[PDB]
Amino acid sequence: RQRFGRLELKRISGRGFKNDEEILIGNGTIQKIGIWDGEEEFHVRCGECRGILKKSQMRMEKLLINSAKKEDMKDLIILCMVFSQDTRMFQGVRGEINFLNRAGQLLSPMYQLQRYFLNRSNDLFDQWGYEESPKASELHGINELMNASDYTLKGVVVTKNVDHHHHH
């Protein structure tokens, strides 16, 4: 298990291997970041929102989450985008990411990005792209407002809250 801010992750599959890399991000600066390599899958959680994340090097491939309070859905999605180190996420930054922690030090790059995008999600979602929603019965698409929609944030899908076995 591990934590990335409010995000909690449990490995489902794959191996965790990290290499330091220099990354030119969207504001024209170079950041030194431990980049994860390899296909990995995780159980993910933020508040009451849970999901499954599938990713590879600097690429969020698929994110399946459940319906929950909208603030927890949105934070889960953003944190997963940042945690996945997706290239679209790096390209979304504008101006300086020079936030200080409570000790007067600069946050490290991954935490700069977490802080930047949690509070400026439209910069992320605009670079992320939208695709047609899935039309597999159990899944629906989700838009920037965390509403069910005919289009969806690319690679993101949501399960419906259904009483499958008629428990009531």
CSV table of N, CA and C in Angstrom, one decimal:
chain,number,residue,atom,x,y,z
A,1,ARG,N,0.8,-1.2,0.0
A,1,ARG,CA,0.0,0.0,0.0
A,1,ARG,C,0.9,1.2,0.0
A,2,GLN,N,0.4,2.3,-0.6
A,2,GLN,CA,1.1,3.6,-0.6
A,2,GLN,C,0.1,4.7,-0.7
A,3,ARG,N,0.6,5.9,-0.4
A,3,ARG,CA,-0.2,7.1,-0.4
A,3,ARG,C,0.4,8.2,-1.3
A,4,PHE,N,-0.4,8.9,-2.0
A,4,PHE,CA,0.0,10.1,-2.7
A,4,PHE,C,-1.0,11.2,-2.5
A,5,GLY,N,-0.8,11.9,-1.4
A,5,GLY,CA,-1.8,12.9,-1.0
A,5,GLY,C,-3.0,12.1,-0.5
A,6,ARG,N,-4.2,12.5,-0.9
A,6,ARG,CA,-5.4,11.8,-0.5
A,6,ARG,C,-5.5,10.5,-1.2
A,7,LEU,N,-4.7,10.2,-2.2
A,7,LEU,CA,-4.8,9.0,-3.0
A,7,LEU,C,-4.2,7.8,-2.3
A,8,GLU,N,-5.0,6.7,-2.1
A,8,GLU,CA,-4.5,5.5,-1.6
A,8,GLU,C,-4.4,4.4,-2.7
A,9,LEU,N,-3.3,3.7,-2.8
A,9,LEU,CA,-3.1,2.7,-3.8
A,9,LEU,C,-2.7,1.3,-3.3
A,10,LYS,N,-3.3,0.3,-3.8
A,10,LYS,CA,-2.9,-1.1,-3.6
A,10,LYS,C,-2.5,-1.8,-4.9
A,11,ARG,N,-1.4,-2.4,-5.0
A,11,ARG,CA,-1.0,-3.0,-6.3
A,11,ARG,C,-1.9,-4.2,-6.6
A,12,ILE,N,-2.3,-4.3,-7.8
A,12,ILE,CA,-3.1,-5.4,-8.3
A,12,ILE,C,-2.2,-6.3,-9.2
A,13,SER,N,-1.3,-5.7,-10.0
A,13,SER,CA,-0.4,-6.4,-10.9
A,13,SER,C,0.7,-5.6,-11.3
A,14,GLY,N,1.7,-6.2,-11.9
A,14,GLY,CA,2.9,-5.5,-12.4
A,14,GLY,C,3.9,-5.4,-11.4
A,15,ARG,N,5.1,-4.9,-11.8
A,15,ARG,CA,6.2,-4.7,-10.9
A,15,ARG,C,6.6,-3.2,-10.8
A,16,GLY,N,6.9,-2.7,-9.6
A,16,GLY,CA,7.3,-1.3,-9.4
A,16,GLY,C,8.7,-1.0,-9.7
A,17,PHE,N,9.0,-0.5,-10.9
A,17,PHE,CA,10.4,0.0,-11.2
A,17,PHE,C,10.6,1.4,-11.6
A,18,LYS,N,11.4,2.2,-10.9
A,18,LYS,CA,11.5,3.6,-11.1
A,18,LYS,C,12.9,4.0,-11.5
A,19,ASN,N,13.0,5.0,-12.5
A,19,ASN,CA,14.3,5.5,-12.9
A,19,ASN,C,14.2,7.1,-12.9
A,20,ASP,N,15.2,7.7,-12.4
A,20,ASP,CA,15.2,9.2,-12.5
A,20,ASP,C,15.3,9.7,-13.9
A,21,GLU,N,14.5,10.6,-14.3
A,21,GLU,CA,14.5,11.2,-15.7
A,21,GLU,C,14.3,12.7,-15.6
A,22,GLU,N,14.8,13.3,-16.6
A,22,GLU,CA,14.6,14.8,-16.8
A,22,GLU,C,13.4,14.9,-17.7
A,23,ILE,N,12.4,15.7,-17.3
A,23,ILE,CA,11.1,15.9,-18.1
A,23,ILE,C,10.9,17.3,-18.4
A,24,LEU,N,10.8,17.7,-19.7
A,24,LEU,CA,10.4,19.0,-20.1
A,24,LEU,C,8.9,19.2,-20.0
A,25,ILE,N,8.4,20.0,-19.0
A,25,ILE,CA,7.0,20.0,-18.8
A,25,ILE,C,6.4,21.3,-19.6
A,26,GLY,N,5.1,21.5,-19.5
A,26,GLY,CA,4.4,22.4,-20.3
A,26,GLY,C,4.7,23.9,-20.2
A,27,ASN,N,5.3,24.2,-19.0
A,27,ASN,CA,5.7,25.6,-18.8
A,27,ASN,C,7.1,25.9,-19.2
A,28,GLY,N,7.8,24.9,-19.9
A,28,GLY,CA,9.1,25.1,-20.5
A,28,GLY,C,10.2,24.9,-19.5
A,29,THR,N,9.9,24.3,-18.3
A,29,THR,CA,11.0,24.0,-17.4
A,29,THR,C,11.3,22.5,-17.4
A,30,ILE,N,12.5,22.2,-17.0
A,30,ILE,CA,12.9,20.8,-16.9
A,30,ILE,C,12.8,20.3,-15.4
A,31,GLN,N,12.1,19.2,-15.2
A,31,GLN,CA,12.0,18.6,-13.9
A,31,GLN,C,12.6,17.3,-13.7
A,32,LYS,N,13.3,17.0,-12.6
A,32,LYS,CA,13.9,15.7,-12.3
A,32,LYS,C,12.9,14.9,-11.6
A,33,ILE,N,12.4,13.8,-12.2
A,33,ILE,CA,11.3,13.0,-11.6
A,33,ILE,C,11.7,11.5,-11.7
A,34,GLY,N,11.3,10.8,-10.6
A,34,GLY,CA,11.5,9.3,-10.6
A,34,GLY,C,10.3,8.8,-11.4
A,35,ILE,N,10.6,8.4,-12.7
A,35,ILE,CA,9.5,7.9,-13.6
A,35,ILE,C,9.3,6.4,-13.5
A,36,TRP,N,8.1,6.0,-13.2
A,36,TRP,CA,7.8,4.5,-13.1
A,36,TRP,C,7.7,3.9,-14.5
A,37,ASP,N,8.3,2.8,-14.7
A,37,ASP,CA,8.4,2.1,-16.0
A,37,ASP,C,7.7,0.7,-15.8
A,38,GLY,N,6.9,0.3,-16.9
A,38,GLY,CA,6.3,-1.0,-16.8
A,38,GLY,C,4.8,-0.9,-16.7
A,39,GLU,N,4.1,-2.0,-17.1
A,39,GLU,CA,2.6,-2.0,-17.0
A,39,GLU,C,2.3,-2.4,-15.5
A,40,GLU,N,1.4,-1.6,-14.9
A,40,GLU,CA,1.0,-1.8,-13.6
A,40,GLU,C,-0.5,-1.6,-13.4
A,41,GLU,N,-1.1,-2.3,-12.5
A,41,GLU,CA,-2.6,-2.0,-12.1
A,41,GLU,C,-2.7,-1.9,-10.6
A,42,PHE,N,-3.6,-1.0,-10.2
A,42,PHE,CA,-3.8,-0.6,-8.8
A,42,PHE,C,-5.2,-0.5,-8.5
A,43,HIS,N,-5.5,-0.9,-7.2
A,43,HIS,CA,-6.8,-0.5,-6.6
A,43,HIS,C,-6.5,1.0,-6.1
A,44,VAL,N,-7.4,1.9,-6.4
A,44,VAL,CA,-7.2,3.2,-6.0
A,44,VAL,C,-8.4,3.8,-5.2
A,45,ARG,N,-8.1,4.7,-4.2
A,45,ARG,CA,-9.2,5.2,-3.4
A,45,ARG,C,-9.0,6.7,-3.0
A,46,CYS,N,-10.0,7.5,-3.1
A,46,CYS,CA,-9.9,8.8,-2.6
A,46,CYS,C,-11.2,9.1,-1.9
A,47,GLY,N,-11.2,9.3,-0.6
A,47,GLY,CA,-12.5,9.4,0.2
A,47,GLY,C,-13.3,8.1,0.0
A,48,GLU,N,-14.5,8.3,-0.5
A,48,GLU,CA,-15.5,7.2,-0.7
A,48,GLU,C,-15.5,6.7,-2.1
A,49,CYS,N,-14.6,7.3,-2.9
A,49,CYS,CA,-14.6,6.9,-4.3
A,49,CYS,C,-13.5,5.9,-4.5
A,50,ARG,N,-13.8,4.7,-5.1
A,50,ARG,CA,-12.8,3.7,-5.3
A,50,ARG,C,-12.8,3.4,-6.8
A,51,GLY,N,-11.6,2.9,-7.2
A,51,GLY,CA,-11.5,2.5,-8.6
A,51,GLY,C,-10.4,1.6,-8.9
A,52,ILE,N,-10.2,1.3,-10.2
A,52,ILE,CA,-9.1,0.5,-10.6
A,52,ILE,C,-8.3,1.3,-11.7
A,53,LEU,N,-7.0,1.4,-11.5
A,53,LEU,CA,-6.2,2.1,-12.4
A,53,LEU,C,-5.2,1.2,-13.2
A,54,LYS,N,-5.2,1.3,-14.5
A,54,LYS,CA,-4.3,0.6,-15.3
A,54,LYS,C,-3.4,1.6,-16.0
A,55,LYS,N,-2.1,1.4,-15.9
A,55,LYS,CA,-1.1,2.4,-16.4
A,55,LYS,C,0.1,1.8,-17.0
A,56,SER,N,0.9,2.5,-17.8
A,56,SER,CA,2.2,2.1,-18.2
A,56,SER,C,3.1,3.3,-18.1
A,57,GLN,N,4.3,3.2,-18.6
A,57,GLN,CA,5.2,4.4,-18.5
A,57,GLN,C,4.6,5.7,-19.0
A,58,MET,N,4.4,6.6,-18.1
A,58,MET,CA,3.9,8.0,-18.4
A,58,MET,C,2.6,7.9,-19.2
A,59,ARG,N,1.8,6.9,-18.9
A,59,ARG,CA,0.5,6.7,-19.6
A,59,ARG,C,-0.5,6.1,-18.8
A,60,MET,N,-1.6,6.9,-18.5
A,60,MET,CA,-2.8,6.3,-17.9
A,60,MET,C,-3.6,5.7,-19.1
A,61,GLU,N,-3.8,4.4,-19.0
A,61,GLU,CA,-4.5,3.6,-20.0
A,61,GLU,C,-6.0,3.5,-19.8
A,62,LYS,N,-6.3,3.2,-18.5
A,62,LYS,CA,-7.7,3.0,-18.2
A,62,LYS,C,-7.9,3.3,-16.7
A,63,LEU,N,-9.1,4.0,-16.4
A,63,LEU,CA,-9.4,4.3,-15.0
A,63,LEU,C,-10.9,4.0,-14.9
A,64,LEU,N,-11.2,3.0,-14.1
A,64,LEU,CA,-12.6,2.7,-13.8
A,64,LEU,C,-12.9,3.0,-12.3
A,65,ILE,N,-13.9,3.9,-12.1
A,65,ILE,CA,-14.3,4.3,-10.8
A,65,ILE,C,-15.8,4.1,-10.5
A,66,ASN,N,-16.1,4.1,-9.2
A,66,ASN,CA,-17.6,4.1,-8.9
A,66,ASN,C,-18.2,5.4,-8.7
A,67,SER,N,-19.5,5.5,-8.7
A,67,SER,CA,-20.2,6.8,-8.4
A,67,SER,C,-20.0,7.1,-7.0
A,68,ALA,N,-19.7,8.3,-6.7
A,68,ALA,CA,-19.5,8.8,-5.3
A,68,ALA,C,-19.7,10.3,-5.2
A,69,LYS,N,-19.6,10.9,-4.0
A,69,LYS,CA,-19.6,12.4,-4.0
A,69,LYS,C,-18.7,12.9,-5.0
A,70,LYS,N,-19.2,14.0,-5.7
A,70,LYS,CA,-18.5,14.5,-6.9
A,70,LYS,C,-17.1,15.0,-6.6
A,71,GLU,N,-16.9,15.6,-5.4
A,71,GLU,CA,-15.5,16.1,-5.1
A,71,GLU,C,-14.5,15.0,-4.9
A,72,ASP,N,-15.0,13.8,-4.5
A,72,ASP,CA,-14.1,12.6,-4.3
A,72,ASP,C,-13.8,12.0,-5.7
A,73,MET,N,-14.8,12.0,-6.5
A,73,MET,CA,-14.6,11.4,-7.9
A,73,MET,C,-13.6,12.3,-8.6
A,74,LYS,N,-13.7,13.6,-8.5
A,74,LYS,CA,-12.9,14.5,-9.3
A,74,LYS,C,-11.4,14.4,-8.7
A,75,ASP,N,-11.3,14.5,-7.4
A,75,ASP,CA,-10.0,14.3,-6.8
A,75,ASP,C,-9.4,13.0,-7.2
A,76,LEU,N,-10.1,11.9,-7.2
A,76,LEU,CA,-9.6,10.6,-7.5
A,76,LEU,C,-9.0,10.6,-9.0
A,77,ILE,N,-9.8,11.1,-9.9
A,77,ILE,CA,-9.4,11.2,-11.3
A,77,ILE,C,-8.1,12.0,-11.4
A,78,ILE,N,-8.1,13.3,-10.9
A,78,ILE,CA,-6.9,14.1,-11.0
A,78,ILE,C,-5.7,13.4,-10.4
A,79,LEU,N,-5.8,12.9,-9.2
A,79,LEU,CA,-4.7,12.3,-8.5
A,79,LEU,C,-4.2,11.1,-9.3
A,80,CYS,N,-5.1,10.3,-10.0
A,80,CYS,CA,-4.6,9.2,-10.8
A,80,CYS,C,-3.9,9.7,-12.0
A,81,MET,N,-4.4,10.8,-12.6
A,81,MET,CA,-3.7,11.3,-13.8
A,81,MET,C,-2.3,11.8,-13.4
A,82,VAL,N,-2.2,12.4,-12.3
A,82,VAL,CA,-0.8,12.9,-11.8
A,82,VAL,C,0.0,11.7,-11.4
A,83,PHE,N,-0.5,10.8,-10.7
A,83,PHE,CA,0.2,9.6,-10.2
A,83,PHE,C,0.7,8.8,-11.4
A,84,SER,N,-0.1,8.7,-12.4
A,84,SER,CA,0.3,7.9,-13.6
A,84,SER,C,1.5,8.6,-14.4
A,85,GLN,N,1.8,9.8,-14.1
A,85,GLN,CA,2.9,10.6,-14.7
A,85,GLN,C,2.6,10.7,-16.2
A,86,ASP,N,1.3,10.8,-16.6
A,86,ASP,CA,0.9,10.8,-18.0
A,86,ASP,C,1.5,12.1,-18.7
A,87,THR,N,1.9,11.9,-19.9
A,87,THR,CA,2.5,13.0,-20.7
A,87,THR,C,1.6,14.2,-20.9
A,88,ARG,N,0.3,13.9,-21.0
A,88,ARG,CA,-0.7,15.0,-21.1
A,88,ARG,C,-0.8,15.8,-19.9
A,89,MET,N,-0.6,15.2,-18.7
A,89,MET,CA,-0.6,15.9,-17.5
A,89,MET,C,0.6,16.8,-17.4
A,90,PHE,N,1.8,16.3,-17.8
A,90,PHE,CA,3.0,17.2,-17.7
A,90,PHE,C,2.8,18.4,-18.6
A,91,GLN,N,2.1,18.2,-19.7
A,91,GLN,CA,2.0,19.3,-20.7
A,91,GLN,C,0.9,20.3,-20.3
A,92,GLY,N,0.2,20.0,-19.3
A,92,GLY,CA,-0.9,20.9,-18.9
A,92,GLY,C,-0.5,22.1,-18.0
A,93,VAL,N,0.8,22.1,-17.5
A,93,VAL,CA,1.2,23.1,-16.6
A,93,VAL,C,1.5,24.5,-17.3
A,94,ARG,N,1.0,25.6,-16.6
A,94,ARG,CA,1.3,26.9,-17.1
A,94,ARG,C,1.8,27.8,-16.0
A,95,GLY,N,2.7,28.7,-16.3
A,95,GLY,CA,3.4,29.5,-15.2
A,95,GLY,C,4.3,28.7,-14.3
A,96,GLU,N,4.8,29.2,-13.3
A,96,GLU,CA,5.7,28.5,-12.4
A,96,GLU,C,5.0,27.6,-11.4
A,97,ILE,N,5.6,26.4,-11.2
A,97,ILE,CA,5.1,25.5,-10.1
A,97,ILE,C,6.2,25.6,-9.0
A,98,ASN,N,6.1,26.6,-8.2
A,98,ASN,CA,7.0,26.9,-7.2
A,98,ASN,C,6.4,27.0,-5.8
A,99,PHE,N,5.4,26.2,-5.5
A,99,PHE,CA,4.7,26.2,-4.2
A,99,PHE,C,5.6,25.8,-3.1
A,100,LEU,N,5.5,26.4,-1.9
A,100,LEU,CA,6.3,26.1,-0.7
A,100,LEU,C,5.5,25.2,0.2
A,101,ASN,N,6.2,24.4,1.0
A,101,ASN,CA,5.5,23.6,2.0
A,101,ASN,C,5.5,24.5,3.3
A,102,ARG,N,4.9,23.9,4.4
A,102,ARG,CA,4.8,24.7,5.6
A,102,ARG,C,6.1,24.9,6.3
A,103,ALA,N,7.2,24.3,5.8
A,103,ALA,CA,8.5,24.5,6.3
A,103,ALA,C,9.4,25.5,5.5
A,104,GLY,N,8.8,26.1,4.5
A,104,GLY,CA,9.5,27.0,3.7
A,104,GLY,C,10.3,26.4,2.6
A,105,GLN,N,10.2,25.1,2.3
A,105,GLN,CA,10.9,24.5,1.2
A,105,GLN,C,10.0,24.3,0.0
A,106,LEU,N,10.6,24.2,-1.2
A,106,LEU,CA,9.8,23.9,-2.4
A,106,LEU,C,9.3,22.4,-2.3
A,107,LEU,N,8.0,22.2,-2.7
A,107,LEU,CA,7.6,20.8,-2.9
A,107,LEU,C,8.4,20.2,-4.0
A,108,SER,N,8.5,18.9,-3.9
A,108,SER,CA,9.2,18.1,-4.9
A,108,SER,C,8.3,18.1,-6.2
A,109,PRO,N,8.8,17.9,-7.4
A,109,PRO,CA,8.0,18.0,-8.6
A,109,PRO,C,6.7,17.2,-8.6
A,110,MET,N,6.6,16.0,-8.2
A,110,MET,CA,5.3,15.3,-8.2
A,110,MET,C,4.3,15.9,-7.3
A,111,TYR,N,4.8,16.5,-6.2
A,111,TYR,CA,3.8,17.1,-5.3
A,111,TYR,C,3.5,18.6,-5.7
A,112,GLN,N,4.4,19.2,-6.4
A,112,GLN,CA,4.1,20.5,-7.1
A,112,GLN,C,2.9,20.2,-8.1
A,113,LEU,N,3.0,19.1,-8.8
A,113,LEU,CA,2.0,18.8,-9.8
A,113,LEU,C,0.6,18.4,-9.2
A,114,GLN,N,0.7,17.7,-8.1
A,114,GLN,CA,-0.5,17.3,-7.4
A,114,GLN,C,-1.2,18.6,-6.9
A,115,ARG,N,-0.4,19.5,-6.3
A,115,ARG,CA,-1.0,20.7,-5.8
A,115,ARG,C,-1.6,21.6,-6.9
A,116,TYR,N,-0.8,21.7,-8.0
A,116,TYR,CA,-1.2,22.6,-9.1
A,116,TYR,C,-2.6,22.1,-9.7
A,117,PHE,N,-2.6,20.8,-10.0
A,117,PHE,CA,-3.8,20.3,-10.7
A,117,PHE,C,-5.1,20.0,-9.9
A,118,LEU,N,-4.9,19.7,-8.6
A,118,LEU,CA,-6.0,19.6,-7.7
A,118,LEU,C,-6.8,20.8,-7.7
A,119,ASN,N,-6.1,22.0,-7.8
A,119,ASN,CA,-6.8,23.3,-7.7
A,119,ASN,C,-6.9,24.0,-9.0
A,120,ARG,N,-6.5,23.3,-10.1
A,120,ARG,CA,-6.6,23.9,-11.4
A,120,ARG,C,-6.9,22.8,-12.4
A,121,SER,N,-8.0,22.1,-12.2
A,121,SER,CA,-8.3,20.8,-12.9
A,121,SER,C,-8.6,21.1,-14.4
A,122,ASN,N,-9.0,22.3,-14.7
A,122,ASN,CA,-9.4,22.5,-16.1
A,122,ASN,C,-8.1,22.5,-17.0
A,123,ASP,N,-7.0,22.9,-16.5
A,123,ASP,CA,-5.7,22.9,-17.2
A,123,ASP,C,-5.3,21.4,-17.6
A,124,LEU,N,-5.7,20.5,-16.7
A,124,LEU,CA,-5.5,19.1,-16.9
A,124,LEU,C,-6.5,18.5,-17.9
A,125,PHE,N,-7.8,18.7,-17.7
A,125,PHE,CA,-8.8,18.1,-18.5
A,125,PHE,C,-8.8,18.6,-19.9
A,126,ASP,N,-8.4,19.9,-20.1
A,126,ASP,CA,-8.3,20.5,-21.4
A,126,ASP,C,-7.2,19.8,-22.2
A,127,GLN,N,-6.1,19.4,-21.6
A,127,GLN,CA,-5.0,18.7,-22.3
A,127,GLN,C,-5.3,17.2,-22.5
A,128,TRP,N,-6.3,16.7,-21.7
A,128,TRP,CA,-6.5,15.2,-21.6
A,128,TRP,C,-7.2,14.7,-22.8
A,129,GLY,N,-8.2,15.4,-23.3
A,129,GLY,CA,-9.0,14.9,-24.4
A,129,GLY,C,-10.2,14.2,-24.0
A,130,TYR,N,-11.2,14.2,-24.9
A,130,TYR,CA,-12.5,13.5,-24.7
A,130,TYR,C,-12.7,12.6,-25.8
A,131,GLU,N,-13.4,11.5,-25.5
A,131,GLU,CA,-13.7,10.4,-26.5
A,131,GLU,C,-15.2,10.0,-26.3
A,132,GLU,N,-15.7,9.3,-27.3
A,132,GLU,CA,-17.1,8.8,-27.1
A,132,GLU,C,-17.2,7.9,-25.9
A,133,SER,N,-18.3,8.0,-25.2
A,133,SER,CA,-18.5,7.2,-24.0
A,133,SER,C,-18.6,5.7,-24.3
A,134,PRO,N,-18.2,4.8,-23.4
A,134,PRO,CA,-18.3,3.4,-23.7
A,134,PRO,C,-19.8,3.0,-23.8
A,135,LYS,N,-20.1,2.1,-24.6
A,135,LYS,CA,-21.5,1.6,-24.6
A,135,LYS,C,-21.5,0.1,-24.3
A,136,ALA,N,-20.7,-0.2,-23.3
A,136,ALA,CA,-20.9,-1.5,-22.6
A,136,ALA,C,-21.8,-1.2,-21.4
A,137,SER,N,-22.8,-2.0,-21.3
A,137,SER,CA,-24.0,-1.8,-20.3
A,137,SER,C,-23.6,-1.4,-18.9
A,138,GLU,N,-22.5,-1.9,-18.4
A,138,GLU,CA,-22.2,-1.6,-17.0
A,138,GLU,C,-21.5,-0.3,-16.7
A,139,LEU,N,-21.0,0.3,-17.8
A,139,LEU,CA,-20.1,1.5,-17.7
A,139,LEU,C,-20.8,2.7,-18.4
A,140,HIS,N,-20.5,3.9,-17.8
A,140,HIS,CA,-20.9,5.1,-18.5
A,140,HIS,C,-19.8,6.1,-18.5
A,141,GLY,N,-19.9,7.1,-19.4
A,141,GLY,CA,-18.8,8.1,-19.6
A,141,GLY,C,-19.0,9.2,-18.6
A,142,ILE,N,-18.0,10.0,-18.3
A,142,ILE,CA,-18.1,11.0,-17.3
A,142,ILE,C,-17.4,12.3,-17.9
A,143,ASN,N,-18.1,13.4,-17.7
A,143,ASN,CA,-17.5,14.7,-18.2
A,143,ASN,C,-16.8,15.5,-17.1
A,144,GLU,N,-16.4,16.7,-17.4
A,144,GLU,CA,-15.6,17.5,-16.4
A,144,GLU,C,-16.4,17.8,-15.1
A,145,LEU,N,-17.7,17.7,-15.2
A,145,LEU,CA,-18.6,18.0,-14.0
A,145,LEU,C,-18.9,16.8,-13.2
A,146,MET,N,-18.3,15.7,-13.6
A,146,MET,CA,-18.5,14.4,-12.9
A,146,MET,C,-20.0,13.9,-13.2
A,147,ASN,N,-20.6,14.3,-14.3
A,147,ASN,CA,-21.9,13.9,-14.7
A,147,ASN,C,-21.8,12.8,-15.7
A,148,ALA,N,-22.8,11.9,-15.7
A,148,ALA,CA,-22.9,10.9,-16.8
A,148,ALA,C,-23.1,11.6,-18.1
A,149,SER,N,-22.4,11.1,-19.1
A,149,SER,CA,-22.3,11.9,-20.4
A,149,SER,C,-22.1,11.1,-21.6
A,150,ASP,N,-22.4,11.6,-22.8
A,150,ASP,CA,-22.2,10.9,-24.0
A,150,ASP,C,-20.8,10.9,-24.5
A,151,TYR,N,-20.0,11.8,-23.9
A,151,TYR,CA,-18.6,11.9,-24.1
A,151,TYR,C,-17.9,11.7,-22.8
A,152,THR,N,-16.6,11.2,-22.8
A,152,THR,CA,-16.0,11.0,-21.5
A,152,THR,C,-14.5,11.4,-21.6
A,153,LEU,N,-13.9,11.8,-20.4
A,153,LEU,CA,-12.5,12.0,-20.3
A,153,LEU,C,-11.8,10.7,-20.9
A,154,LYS,N,-10.9,10.9,-21.7
A,154,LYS,CA,-10.3,9.7,-22.4
A,154,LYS,C,-9.8,8.7,-21.4
A,155,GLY,N,-10.3,7.4,-21.6
A,155,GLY,CA,-9.8,6.3,-20.8
A,155,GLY,C,-10.5,6.2,-19.4
A,156,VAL,N,-11.4,7.1,-19.1
A,156,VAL,CA,-12.1,7.1,-17.8
A,156,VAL,C,-13.5,6.6,-18.0
A,157,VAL,N,-13.9,5.6,-17.1
A,157,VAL,CA,-15.3,5.1,-17.1
A,157,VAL,C,-15.8,5.0,-15.7
A,158,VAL,N,-17.1,5.0,-15.6
A,158,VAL,CA,-17.8,5.0,-14.3
A,158,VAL,C,-18.8,3.8,-14.2
A,159,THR,N,-18.8,3.1,-13.1
A,159,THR,CA,-19.8,2.1,-12.8
A,159,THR,C,-21.1,2.7,-12.3
A,160,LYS,N,-22.2,2.2,-12.6
A,160,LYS,CA,-23.5,2.6,-12.0
A,160,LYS,C,-23.7,1.9,-10.7
A,161,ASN,N,-24.4,2.6,-9.7
A,161,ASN,CA,-24.8,2.0,-8.5
A,161,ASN,C,-26.1,1.2,-8.6
A,162,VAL,N,-25.9,-0.1,-8.9
A,162,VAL,CA,-27.1,-1.0,-9.2
A,162,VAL,C,-27.2,-2.1,-8.2
A,163,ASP,N,-28.5,-2.4,-7.8
A,163,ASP,CA,-28.8,-3.5,-7.0
A,163,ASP,C,-28.9,-4.8,-7.8
A,164,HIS,N,-27.7,-5.3,-8.2
A,164,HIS,CA,-27.6,-6.4,-9.2
A,164,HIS,C,-28.4,-7.7,-8.9
A,165,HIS,N,-28.4,-8.0,-7.6
A,165,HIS,CA,-29.0,-9.3,-7.2
A,165,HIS,C,-30.3,-9.1,-6.5
A,166,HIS,N,-30.9,-8.0,-6.7
A,166,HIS,CA,-32.2,-7.6,-6.1
A,166,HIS,C,-32.3,-7.9,-4.6
A,167,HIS,N,-31.3,-7.4,-3.9
A,167,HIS,CA,-31.2,-7.4,-2.4
A,167,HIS,C,-32.2,-6.5,-1.8
A,168,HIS,N,-32.4,-5.3,-2.4
A,168,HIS,CA,-33.1,-4.2,-1.8
A,168,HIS,C,-32.5,-3.8,-0.5
